[PDB]
Design a protein around this ligand. Structure first.
Ligand SMILES: *[C@@H](CC(=O)OCC)[C@H](C[C@@H]1CCNC1=O)NC(=O)[C@H](CC(C)C)NC(=O)[C@@H](NC(=O)OCc1ccccc1)[C@@H](C)OC(C)(C)C
Ligand SMILES: *[C@@H](CC(=O)OCC)[C@H](C[C@@H]1CCNC1=O)NC(=O)[C@H](CC(C)C)NC(=O)[C@@H](NC(=O)OCc1ccccc1)[C@@H](C)OC(C)(C)C
Lengths: 306, 306
């Protein structure tokens, strides 16, 4: 039993991290087969921060203007190209520890593991969700750009995030591994701001089911609700609407606990209208929304503590 | 910026996990050089759960009664010995991915990363503290025994925990890597219970400093306190006493923020007496006590958001 914010084991990704240097700028790259992926702002200077023209900056570079370092060996760049906001460096050496991998672009509300890296060296791993406003509440300092987010499925690593920037509220923004930003952000230091965020309703519900599976029932009640009436309450507390698709996704958790999805919605409505009254749920004093239904099934026992 | 429960990268430990089988019982082992470490209760039967005599059970075994599996290769046991509550299996093959490592026994209030494993296969990583009552609030199911907890320092892995058992309240108990239990627990299914726990005061204070470093000051106040008067309040809220050693450990965080340790103690006292009043600190609605001062320094920027 127990329930923890659980990252995937990071070893398959640690073997892919390198250091990329252009000019005097250094950040992290992702080395897969004979290509190194990294944020294109590594070709910026201190002056090209406000409105850089990256196509113009890039045509001014040669292959030998880039330095790639894997551990304590240098990799020679033998070709380069820009793809959206990522740079791809073709290197003379295929990464021997390349895992089975995919590039995936995730939907808001999906979670992933982040391997924070500095100077090509992994420093930590934590679990993140893509917020509805397409930011992540990460932990990133200078030098962290090029750190990647990923999920792991049967030894296949699905890379879904590369880190590019921090917003004024302290949340983080970046791209898929093809260099497309999540959300409306761009990789320049012009005024940008995270939109208003909302709570990921389907994940709160999954997490309440986790709490039931682990033996805690105190927040349940005898009431039910309709999908429409729930969403009227959801809107009022800045929760995302719950769709029939979300209802169907919660199916297995409903079945293992015997609690119908809309019965758990009436529990959540009561928690929203009344608070927790000094109580905790799975050790938390607020409603957690960064566990997907898949995260709950992955970590919880398949037999509920009846 | 940001602040997350951050585990160490787990790759160096993933390379050491194997599956150990004796009879029909299977659990996880730690493969370092030519020795596999695993909990001795792998030699138990369904009948030898209440009061097993492990010396008696073990003399009845041969080397060929143990099966060690690393990935999809079998390792042959060429020798065995019991050390406290761990079994050591000498194997014919030295682990080629053995990292630089140490065995360390940690004090209560220290944190570590846990690589949860099932059948020798890593499944997740999360961050734990050794509670003052020598339990950890982990996430462990059947099959998880032999999973290990560790810290990483300059590519040296310090193993500090091996998982053995769950207590009725859902918290977890285990040993150092020499097989000595943390706390008064024993590896048999006789009635045992976690003692009353207390909050790790020095860690709460470190975490308040993290919040200051990341730009949040709302909970500070103009007051100070003496060490003695703080601890009188600490006792009242089931917090551990703060020692002069704890004061000195918080030194660097005090210096980076300009907030004297005893001034932050007067802030904590106010938070304890008044609550948060609907506010959060680093996104949390309760006072977090599973970040050591060292954890804060490791993750936070060295320059405070003034
Ligand atoms: C990765 C590379 C790096 O370290 O470069 C250092 C010079 C960083 C990761 C950041 C740094 C701190 N935490 C992080 O996650 N990314 C960057 O430095 C970004 C480079 C841009 C060219 C994309 N810049 C920022 O992250 C920047 N944000 C930003 O400018 O947003 C646009 C903006 C919003 C409001 C007002 C003006 C501009 C950060 C560094 O600036 C602050 C003030 C928002 C923190
Ligand atoms: C690891 C090996 C395993 O899976 O064996 C399965 C048969 C597990 C890890 C546990 C299982 C669930 N979550 C975990 O972390 N360890 C064990 O099964 C332990 C083997 C003993 C021989 C040490 N047993 C327990 O963990 C057991 N606790 C226990 O008996 O504590 C003593 C006790 C306390 C009060 C009353 C009676 C006995 C668990 C499985 O039992 C419960 C009821 C406390 C959950």
């Amino acid at each position: 039993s127990g329930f923890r914010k659980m990252a995937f084991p990071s070893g398959k990704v640690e073997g892919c991290m390198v250091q990329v240097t252009c000019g005097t700028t250094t950040l992290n790259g992702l080395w897969l087969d004979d290509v190194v992926y990294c944020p294109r702002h590594v070709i910026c200077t201190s002056e090209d921060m406000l409105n850089p023209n990256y196509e113009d900056l890039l045509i001014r570079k040669s292959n030998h203007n880039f330095l790639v370092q894997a551990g304590n060996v240098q990799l020679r760049v033998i070709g380069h190209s820009m793809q959206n906001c990522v740079l791809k460096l073709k290197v003379d050496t295929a990464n021997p520890k390349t895992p089975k991998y995919k590039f995936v672009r995730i939907q808001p509300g999906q979670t992933f593991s982040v391997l924070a890296c500095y100077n090509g060296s992994p420093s930590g791993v934590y679990q993140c969700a893509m917020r509805p406003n397409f930011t992540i509440k990460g932990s990133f300092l200078n030098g962290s750009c090029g750190s990647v987010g990923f999920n792991i499925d049967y030894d296949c690593v699905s890379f879904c995030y590369m880190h590019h920037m921090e917003l004024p509220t302290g949340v983080h923004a970046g791209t898929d591994l093809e260099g497309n930003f999540y959300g409306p952000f761009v990789d320049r230091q012009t005024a940008q701001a995270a939109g208003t965020d909302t709570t990921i309703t389907v994940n709160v519900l999954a997490w309440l089911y986790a709490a039931v599976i682990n033996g805690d029932r105190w927040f349940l009640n005898r009431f039910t609700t309709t999908l429409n009436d729930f969403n009227l309450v959801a809107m009022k507390y800045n929760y995302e609407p719950l769709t029939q698709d979300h209802v169907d996704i919660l199916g297995p958790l409903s079945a293992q606990t015997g609690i119908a999805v809309l019965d758990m919605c009436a529990s959540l409505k009561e928690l929203l209208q009344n608070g927790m009254n000094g109580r905790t749920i799975l050790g938390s004093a607020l409603l957690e929304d960064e566990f997907t239904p898949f995260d709950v099934v992955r970590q919880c026992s398949g037999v509920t503590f009846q």
